[model samples]
Target: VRIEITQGVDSARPIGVVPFKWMGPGTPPEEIGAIVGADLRNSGKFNPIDAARMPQQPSTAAEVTPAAWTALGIDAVVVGQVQPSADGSYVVSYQLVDTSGSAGSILAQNQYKVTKQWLRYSAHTVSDEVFEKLTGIKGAFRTRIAYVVKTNGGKFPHELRVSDYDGYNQFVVHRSPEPLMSPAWSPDGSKIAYVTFESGKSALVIQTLANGAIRQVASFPRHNGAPAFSPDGTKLAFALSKSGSLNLYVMDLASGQISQVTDGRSNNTEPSWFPDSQNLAYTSDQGGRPQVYKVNINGGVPQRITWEGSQNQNADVSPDGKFLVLVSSAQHIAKQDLETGAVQVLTDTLLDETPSIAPNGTMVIYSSTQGLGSVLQLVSTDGRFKARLPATDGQVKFPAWSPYL
Candidate 1:
């Protein structure tokens, strides 16, 4: 079946991804295909056809008559086959077809062979290929997210954490008797830059994922908070008041030299890099209240991004660079439209802040108060998937999405 592709509204791209064919007697995991479909659908970018829609397809590349699919208004079709290899490995191959043509257009083809345990990853790779071919952008399906989990304890509360994109495997990397905020992942997704208040004053720390090594990036006597990594990962943009006022500064990671970015009376924090690697979006009170603003990485005229709401803080640009996810304190946790000033409230919960958007921009994981308990929760940007990240032993806060692995 043929489908048209055009620049349109926020509706998901209607697609037909057929079930994978079995090559061996042993059945593969039943959830593999569905999981991949769910991952793509959760991104708010795809709407896959149900198995009951069109049941008969010989292979992944089997051509459906143009009249059948075009009449249904499908955009694309994905078909794949899985074959078991010797030594207990599996080989999967898939192709994406643009259904706009009468015969259909071949968008992409990819093949991967891996062990049973890595089938999920192979599926993600297929998704990456299809997404990039259709949208003309790199795929972030294989990325991960890092966040902080706040917990109550007898002596200590608030703990830092890192977790997978789906919130499946979670581990605590740091915990403290005080508090932790603003966890930012490195460009390569191997480490994080965060602010900790364990020493009576706020201190910025960089912790590596390789050996659990910790380095104090900045520990000023005054305020040192909201650390973010540049696109090249060579420098860090942070906020500190050591200069007698809470201002923005860029620190060279290699030379330890600090350059001021914002010198006005306002406090600038929560710096987020745009995909172009030349500009950044941050929060500042320059216009009276906290609002989302943008500035060149080298420091220049700061442009405001949010104006409809009274307050917009902790803004993070999606990896795709299409939308901006932020916590609008005007009345609720609102996801502001980056292009337009329109705002969509994602959550009704009070005290929601520190939102870390997924690398795929499918969902956002943020810290919110759940009754008397403080916990990390995941809310789909499109409200398709919502749940609490299974709790760790401690409380969680300040969640950040790591780069694609």
Candidate 2:
């Protein structure tokens, strides 16, 4: 996917990322400054100045002339360098300096070592630190996202893929002849659990990112879907229809023991665990139309949480459990305040679905139709910023935002 950030009504703060000086035998394999620039620009809070228009090229704070940057109305600037390590690895160091004031005070500085294969990862890690230094909120750039892409249009057309939050270094984890959906990340972000029909029936499976190993978690009968990991990572929550009507179930990852969380004649699916493992917010149709509801894990009456929307499904609780992001009216993405029950429409995109809130609660990534083709869209929880990730090929859908690693 290509990254093209659209400026929102709230103007982003101006910043600059000078190209890093490379101290290696060959040219740098990755553009560290550009990657960081993309991350900050996508946040909708910072506008990275064009490299070509930068008044000066400085890879270190000592060389940063605050007067030159401030003349361009820039707030801060990032300077860094890559040095070859003794063991053939590379050490990436970065510094965030305040360009708005004199003396160019160093706001943040850090370094990390990574092999050639992990250059992009190192760049993203630097972005995370630099972002947190500029904004008080933690950065989600270090996290990854999973989505399903359909190509060739056939029984075996679907492929499960994972990539950096910046939409780069993407690779398929598995290919299925049947449909694949509802990809969810473990609390630690090492594994992703999803629903697939490769078993000739719907089943829940977890794939380890490091090993590419797929372990089937549940495959009872009929329909099994919407696999989500608990906050503590000890249990997995999912939707199963083994007993006729669709309901929600949680399985202990270690013991493989299953416990029913929600049971009724009406369909209860798309379970999103609350920050505390004590409860889960999910979608249910018991109220005539699909609406969001929450129930305790130790068995209790399900409480209807959404009353304003005619249709609300695929609800995902924020990392703090303060809000729920769901497709309202089945045509727009909306965030409902858990404390006051206030609903805020986040998107105007038609046919919006499956919103995955960022690990930092700063954005929501979802799938929506763009000119008849499916695309990945993003919007901040406050609805102040909006952007879309355009795929290089085929249609992409069913996005799952991973927790910070």
Candidate 3:
């Protein structure tokens, strides 16, 4: 399936990925080349040439003819082969070639042992390798994403799902008859913490990804939601209302010790930790309107970080700690530069919320209304590259991009 790039950078490099040669089988179980091409195209960095337009199908670096690709103005070429293995598995191999140089220099090559069921994931692994080698940034293609999908005419309306970054191989992690919200991933990407209203009250629960084990970490009297893990994965920062007013708090995962991070009369919530793990940025109404604020985990006066929009909240700090992606004016998603305090609106569409930054800090994924229902959209950090995930059965929200896998 073609991923529509709504807006892309003008400098997107053109590349070609020839269809992989299939051996020892009537047909390949998965389209490994197509998957890699889609990943590169969706990234808004590299533009993959259409297979139908390619001059030839080369399965190895030695077989690739640079003159053919160079004539088509292609900057790079990726060729590969897939062969059935002896143990009911498959051997996948690929090579990245720079076509702009003399007769196409081989940049990188690798092979993988993959099962039939894991061909798609193995394809993403190849995409990640090529992306990192070309872009100088670690690729997030092999990572997973967690989000909440609410279906109307079902016993369980709300279902939390984990899927590939490209919205494939989706599997439900949790289903609730009530409501689920604010899914957060641990630093290691091994667990997820989210809020569920199963007991008729908001409560925080951490679910292990490996075995589906769940443990209620917080069930305050009134509300416990918006759980975020520290950079070290040792503590959880969340919003609680047990103190009569909603406020920010941190909990030690080992000892179950809870410490209040912010003490204010106004509502404070949606806490996100910085890479340093000692400071947290959260949403607060202490300034008469909801805005982003930073405070130390140990306890200190809150420092307001946003001042432009009427209301800014749900602040997610980038991995580099240089920017924050948040809901601006309750209408659009915005990115704020930490050093300069300059805020730029990233989305033109209204009703955008819950911006989650990728682990690579290159893109922001959030929920927005496309028509009558909501869909997930990804935009680059500079508001250049834009793409939308295909709409599901119902409204999608609370997208949490996982860490690099």
Candidate 4:
């Protein structure tokens, strides 16, 4: 399904993306132009001109007329073609043209040779290149997202699914008759650590994405959940309820060793790693109600980060470590500045939860109730652009954005 940009910032620059020409045996399998346009629109930085309204359809920069696009108020134009390779693969070539200049000039040009199944991904690759060249920021169009879907609640109640960033090419990574929550991506984007209850008790399991290999990393007595991988991926920081109270612990993946990071009678959970991998932020009720707290990995005093919100949890840090996206007051998703403690509510929905920041830190994805079930929604960092995944047959929750692949 194509992601619809429900609300885009009015200051976005207007651009044009012509329909890509297909040079193949029969017909191109996908609409590469539409894919690229959607990617740019989703970023809330550019407005793509309607292809049907364009005066000319140019597949190359030389064929484009700068005056026509400039008259239509287009600052830039993108032209591309897809051709079938002799090796049974496909080559996608594209050029970005600056139409606002005196004469249209090529700003970027690139091509990708990919297999049949990867044609769509190759289109996203082109989108990323164009985006980075134009905006000077890396694009996350080629990344993937993971979430949990539940339908027809019965024996097998939930399924953990992974898909492209736009909710395409989805496949179930794990199915369980019980509940699942908190799926976290490893730093390298090669594995996932999630909480599963397939054993009739909460257990944190790490699964490799290359193959379906699974390993139970944490299975304590009462409750073992909220597994999060460190920034370096060598260790995992999670919460355990072993010593008659909930607390945080770090486990070394290389060796079967565990060290407690937080102690006391207060419940500490939802551990998220800082970019440095030397500190972790978690949710705790030690200060009366649930609030965000940070603790050093080498054992230090836990410091509170949230005081204005009624309660905050499910904290996910930005790549730069300056901002955090979290569920504030158990309702809306909010962003907090790490330095000044200023807060900005990023969502209007009331039931938003599990807000995850994109690898580029420009967008945030979270789970919220729409009509009767939960669905995943994306919002720009400044809370201007908004979009949601197409309606599915079940409820979607626990969205975890993957790192750059």
Candidate 5:
């Protein structure tokens, strides 16, 4: 997806990312500094100053003149180099220097050796470290986002794709002529459980990330959908209508035992787990036109969690369980504070849905409508920063942000 910065970042700190010095004989495999700069800029938190456009391009912190960068109004600078080892691996080193004082403040410096194909990933790791050292918040540049892409005017099989957070290195995890929906990531970020219609009926299947192993976890009658893995990774929760109406169910992954968590006539789906793993927030129309509700896995009376919106579904809880990002009435995304019982709409667009919170709870990524079909839009928690993730591969749906890898 093409990232367009829609708003915010006016007061973003100006940071310089210098092109890494290539010490190898042949051409560098990847532009390490460029990837890091893009990652920082796309974060909507920092303004990256590329060395390619700057007058002084220092490849290492030792070569950086603090006075020169300070005169240029630069705040921090990242400089690095890539060296080739005898084993054909690349040894990358980077340093983050704050240009405040004459001697400067060395914020971070690290090095790692990796294979040729992992050069891009290594750059992302550098971005993550630099971001956290500056903001005290963990960066998700190294994380991946999984979404469904459809082609051929809905005639072709659906493809489940995953990509780097900045819409790079996208690859298909699974593809099928039938529909696939609602992917839930395991706590360890290894498996994804999604609903499939390949067997002429709805079923929940878990696919292993590394081995491409597919395991059918549920094939209940009527309908089965909205799979969510518990924070502990020992249980999978989903909505099933096997016994009549759609209701929430939790399956013990170890024993494959299914137990109903929410019951009655109303459809209860889109389960999102609280951090404790003992409870889940789900959508149920039992209390009118589909509102967010929370209940324990053991089963009990569900408590209404949202009242401002006419409808609030597809609730995704924050990693800390302190808030939820859900689709408010009229297809807008809203963030609800669990402790204060407050709600703030995050999206101004009318077609936003399937909102997923970042692992650090600083941003929300959701599906947005484009003329081409559907694209992804990301917004900061405060509704200040916004960016559109444009993809050429038809409609994008059900974006699931991965936990820190």
Candidate 6:
């Protein structure tokens, strides 16, 4: 479900998620609610009220009185019930309620029935629904991220890897001595598009998620870099310098038809799609130096987005269409505002690039050179939560975070 966030809610709004009631004949499942609470807390956004602080346990909406939560200073409450299905599967139903008034609004409710194999996903879905209802944004707890990890020699050889959003369950997809750049996720979270150089020429490769099948989509005579999928995943907008100058082009994924999107005397690269897919934002050097610009998907005069900075490249748009995170090589490693051109420096000395925001738009993962070698670092969009992923023996780069899986 796509929700439009109008006004920002109070950052200190305390919320509560109650333990699910079990209707099964046997004992209930493990602490599902606790796991859901932990997921929300990790985002560094929500303040989840612990059950130990609650005056009483409320398993249903009717039982959760407003005065009870009001006294506890909770902005909202989540309650639900669960049961074992007739076929021996488990079914869960949950709802989010506003606890400010006597009669509160039901934010969301969902029912899920799953076998033992899918209980984890079932719990995640319930958590996702509650999260969206309270935060007014989609949950990325179910998504994945892809990145390239350098191994062995601290230098040339690399391996393509896909892992959970938190950088767990990492599995290598491809290993090669050649260079790879710009790993991007498909709209349905099924495939990824990236640039691989071999035989002295750059080629665009699409790898399927179900199997290890790889297909080359486009191979230009010159440079090919920064492949990005459109919002609908029907086409791709990428940078190719086949015509002797680096320019952005869109290729229909189904028919392999290519159409140039930008034409100028300067280099145009790093195409990022708008959430609507009819338009895209990219970085071009039309005005002497590299700066971010937006243009129609078909063709039109590009509008420059950044003015305060002379060098702005490697741009990625937030999924909500509210913010743009890019690398600005002006004074520091920073994230700049696309609307007001305001800039916030994230790292003081580290040379950071390739900032990819999570589907939830809460965090970003980027490549940076630290100490003697380069590494992949994760930073919150607000600069509150920051951590580095465990290095896989060498440097990592071109991290692409996927939408909700």
For every model shown, what is its TM-score relative to the native structure?
0.79, 0.94, 0.96, 0.96, 0.95, 0.81
| lDDT on C-alpha atoms for all candidate structures | 0.73, 0.86, 0.88, 0.88, 0.86, 0.76
Model 6 regions more than 4 Å off: 1-11, 19-31, 50-58, 62-68, 80-89, 101-107, 153-157, 198-200, 220-223, 286-288, 320-322, 330-339, 344-349, 360-362, 369-394
Task: Give the per-residue lDDT digits (tens) of candidate 4, residues 5-98.
Answer: 6787887888898889999767788889999998888888998888889989999988888999989898789899998878888788999998
lDDT of 2: 0.86
The runs of at least 3 residues in candidate 4 whose Cα sits more than 4 Å from the true structure, single-residue gaps closed, are 153-155, 221-223
Residue runs of model 2 more than 4 Å from their true location after superposition = 7-10, 24-26, 153-155, 220-223
For candidate 1, the TM-score is 0.79
Clashing pairs in 2: none
Stronger candidate by TM-score (4 vs 5): 4
Model 3's lDDT to the true fold?
A: 0.88
> Candidate 5's residue-wise lDDT over 1-405, tens digit each?
358888867887788898888998888988899888988887778888756667577777678889888887887899999999999899999999888888667899899899988898999999999999999999888888899988766555698988888887888999988888888889889999888888986788999999899999878654568898998989999888876889988999999998988877998888999999999999989987999899988757889898787888899999889999999875799999999989988888758879998898888899987665788889998787899875655778999999889
Which of candidates 2 and 6 is the stronger one according to TM-score? 2
The candidate 1 region of ten consecutive residues with least summed lDDT is: 1-10
lDDT tens digits, residues 28-131, model 6?
A: 76556765665566565676787888766677677777788888788688787778887878887777878778865677778888887666566678778887
Error of 3 at 33 (Å): 0.7
lDDT (C-alpha) at residue 24 in model 4: 74
Q: In model 6, how large is the Cα lDDT of residue 162? A: 90
